[PDB]
Amino acid sequence: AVVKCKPTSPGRRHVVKVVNPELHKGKPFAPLLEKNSKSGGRNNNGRITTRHIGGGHKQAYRIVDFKRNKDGIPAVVERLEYDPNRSANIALVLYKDGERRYILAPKGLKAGDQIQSGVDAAIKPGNTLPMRNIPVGSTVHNVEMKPGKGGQLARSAGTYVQIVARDGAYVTLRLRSGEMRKVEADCRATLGEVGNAEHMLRVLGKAGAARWRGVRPTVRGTAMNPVDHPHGGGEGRNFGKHPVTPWGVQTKGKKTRSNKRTDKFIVRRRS
Amino acid sequence: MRHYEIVFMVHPDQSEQVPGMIERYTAAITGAEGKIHRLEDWGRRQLAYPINKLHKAHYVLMNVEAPQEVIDELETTFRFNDAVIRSMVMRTKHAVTEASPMVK
Amino acid sequence: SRVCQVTGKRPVTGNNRSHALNATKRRFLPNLHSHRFWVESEKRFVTLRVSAKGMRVIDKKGIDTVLAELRARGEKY
């Protein structure tokens, strides 16, 4: 439920919260946590590789089952939890033999439902089965690219991938970007759209709310000196040049994909 | 309960598996304490027009007096099975028992 | 290190000469490839980071002759 905030102060004027009352109001499950130390966008050389990353609230990492290998054993869903590590909410599930794991929460999943992986699983939102067992034309998420590698496609808060075709060893997918990609028919996928679909309806409202998420401010390139950026300089506002990166690569329109290994897997590009 | 008339259309190469499907469906209905009034295999039959790039199909008529909850379970069985091509469920005012004009 | 294990080839340094004969220092890297060679006597594969010249040497001398030299040189393989 989106909640428009009342304008008691500027900085609360434009805030829309996304309030989900079903999330667990307690501590997360302690065995599945581990330390997630921040980086600041800096590699092992100490240099800033990717800009604008730094600060933000401390975040513990939640070990999430993407591989989803407990086949045959049914699992009931204990509660839904908030995950700071990702945009989608996660679900704490309890198998029959007593193991607890975290999965990505699908759209219609709530506390108390039963999920089950494996080939003999039913087709309800939550089950995970190889895509030679999933009917053509259904919406799945948490899709593997390689069998047993773990789900890599359609993991962000409201995404999903449709299965449009199958020719023997491959299935053809309609990715969320609109790209048509071939994936082997033995890769696991999880039924239904992924949960937190109204995540994109939030508006942060103030500058500090982006600093809470560890997003340092972005200085636009024309506000610099020519030693700093190709856009920099000028006596006033001058931009008489084609828009490039800080490293002189065209940005408005120039393609950058240079992977000739995976070109056989791409049916059509995005539009 | 609610008298339904169910007719489904089987892929003709799966014509051998048809009495195995009918006995499960009757056990779905009678297991849910529903009645089955007539049950008329029509065999292979030439289609009026080729559905799904093929020219023949195997027809089964089935009249059922079941509660509406298990028929909705039964419809999903027709949806995900690839042996059945088309399925049509039609609500009927009463229980019909007389033979079909093409069973004749 | 870009060193062929068989022939001992090594990146040498030279010049890029332009049309106006402007000399900038460059390197000549050897055409190294990691290749599994079947040793028939020891009945196993041995990976050697070897140049394509060295693969011509192994095709001429034989892998048993070359691995004798690598032990006589004192080089792991």
Binding site: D120 | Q14 | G62
Partner: protein
């Protein structure tokens, strides 16, 4: 790449032939599979005086080791009681090694590289046929019935 052969290869020569090949064909396939020796003049006098008929003796005892094993594989039934769904629609597929696991249990102790399959999956629950490559030339067939568990 002048090379002497240790076995007949289907497109260039029989045993005892000195035929030009490409370098990548001898170095990657023929020599590492024991099918050819590079034509060194030390190896020719090693081969041509003695092994031109000694290996011909060893080639016959290999085809005779097949023709004893391949002949008794006419029992022509392999019951693999795998889990399946209803009305066909097999639960879990059967690959080459699972076929090789069960013909091991009835007949020749066979390997996973011997099984030849047009589909490989055998998704259809029921009976099927499986061709073999027990020799490079001499082939066998066994009807295999995939049975629901």
């Amino acid at each position: 790449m002048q090379v002497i052969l240790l076995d007949k290869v289907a497109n260039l020569g029989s045993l005892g032939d000195q035929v030009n090949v490409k370098a990548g064909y001898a170095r990657n396939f023929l020599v590492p599979q024991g099918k050819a020796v590079p034509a060194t003049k030390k190896n020719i006098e090693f081969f041509e005086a003695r092994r031109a008929e000694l290996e011909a003796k060893l080639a016959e005892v290999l085809a005779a080791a097949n023709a004893r094993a391949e002949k008794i594989n006419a029992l022509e039934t392999v019951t693999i009681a795998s889990k399946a769904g209803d009305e066909g629609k097999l639960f879990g597929s059967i690959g080459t090694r699972d076929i090789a696991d069960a013909v091991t249990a009835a007949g020749v102790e066979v390997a996973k590289s011997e099984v030849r399959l047009p589909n490989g999956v055998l998704r259809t629950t029921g009976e099927h046929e499986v061709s073999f490559q027990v020799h490079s030339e001499v082939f066998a067939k066994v009807i295999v019935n995939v049975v629901a568990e």
